[PDB]
């Protein structure tokens with residue numbers, strides 16, 4: 449079971465999507481990390497350049513990691529489990545319609561999901577869990593981590 453042996457982790461948004469403003473992209477990512485932060489001992493710090501533990505980027509089709517995106521819809525994003533280098537990093541399919549709304553696909557929800565993987569969780573079979581394999585929109589204002597996911601991170605760290 450890979451896990452980070454450190455609690456203050458850094459992240460870097462290497463690039464953006466034109467769909468949303470840069471403040472909106474940064475807010476989606478910030479709040480997505482807060483979710484896990486309030487149920488665990490992890491603290492996330494944003495760096496603007498440099499080698500962060502978790503890199504966040506928007507890429508298209510082939511992007512040098514042997515797991516290419518597939519265009520609009522289908523696979524939305526992917527993350528790597530805790531570890532060195534590529535470990536912990538998260539990529540979003542630049543070919544998607546990324547939103548701030550109920551319209552497909554909400555960057556905050558997808559981000560929150562990916563970060564679970566970046567922290568070491570696997571997919572849940574509970575349809576109400578964030579770590580459930582398929583995307584579903586849920587209200588995001590005042591969003592809080594479903595109980596199955598809390599169980600999940602707590603079982604890893606504490």
Ligand SMILES: CC(C)C[C@H](C(=O)NO)C(=O)N[C@@H](CC(=O)O)C(=O)NCc1ccccc1
Pocket residue numbers: 521522523524525526527557558561562565578579580581582583584
């Ligand atoms: C390539 C594998 C790793 C699948 C990938 C994934 O789980 N990202 O971690 C993914 O793109 N899953 C899609 C599945 C789909 O087409 O619906 C998804 O919606 N991921 C994001 C998601 C899942 C559950 C809740 C919120 C967001």
Ligand SMILES: [Ca+2]
Pocket residue numbers: 517518519520521522523524541543544
């Ligand atoms: Ca896709």
Ligand SMILES: [Ca+2]
Pocket residue numbers: 500501502503531532533534535536537
């Ligand atoms: Ca990394």
Ligand SMILES: [Zn+2]
Pocket residue numbers: 511513515526539
């Ligand atoms: Zn990738």
Ligand SMILES: [Zn+2]
Pocket residue numbers: 561562565571581
């Ligand atoms: Zn997933």
